Amino acid sequence: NEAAINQAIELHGFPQRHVKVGKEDGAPVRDNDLRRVRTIFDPRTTDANTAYFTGQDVDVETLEAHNFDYSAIHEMDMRNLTTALGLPLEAGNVGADGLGSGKPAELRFALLK
């Protein structure tokens, strides 16, 4: 599950840029054409302050960071592993509401002792 998240963050935790070339039902575009477009909009040489200038038949589109709750997956994984090892949930650096106070807490400290 850790390996899954580690890979998934690189793909889905960050956006990506999708440059689209040509027109709907328009002229054909080929690899040697895209090679020039790629050279212009290259992330390797792009700076944050940049501006782009085009005709109407070039588009820049966004693959968003397609959000998922990897934090809650981490918490479930850690909940499983800690309690499987007999350790308290807190030993995995995972918090919970209420369960840090009073007899709800002190019982788990008793179990550990």
Binding site: N80, T83, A84, G86, A110, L111
Partner: protein, 75 residues
């Protein structure tokens, strides 16, 4: 009245459990996970804090068990 049971006991000779059912219990114990940990926590609550022995009026005895006085609690 009487010195031995006269009311019956609802089980003899079977149709009530087997080594197979007992080996399922062994598997639940040894296969780990949260399931095993809860029953182990249950055992630790009931028995994990230790025990103490007393004997009622023990010191009325100071018996020479091996040439020197002892109590039953010591024994």
């Amino acid at each position: 009245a009487s010195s031995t049971p006269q009311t019956n006991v609802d089980s003899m000779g079977g149709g009530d459990l087997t080594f197979e059912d007992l080996r399922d219990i062994k598997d639940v114990r040894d296969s780990g996970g949260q399931v095993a940990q809860l029953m182990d926590y249950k055992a630790l609550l009931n028995f994990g804090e230790g025990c103490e022995i007393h004997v009622e009026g023990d010191d009325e005895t100071k018996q020479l068990v091996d040439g020197e006085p002892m109590t039953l609690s010591e024994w």
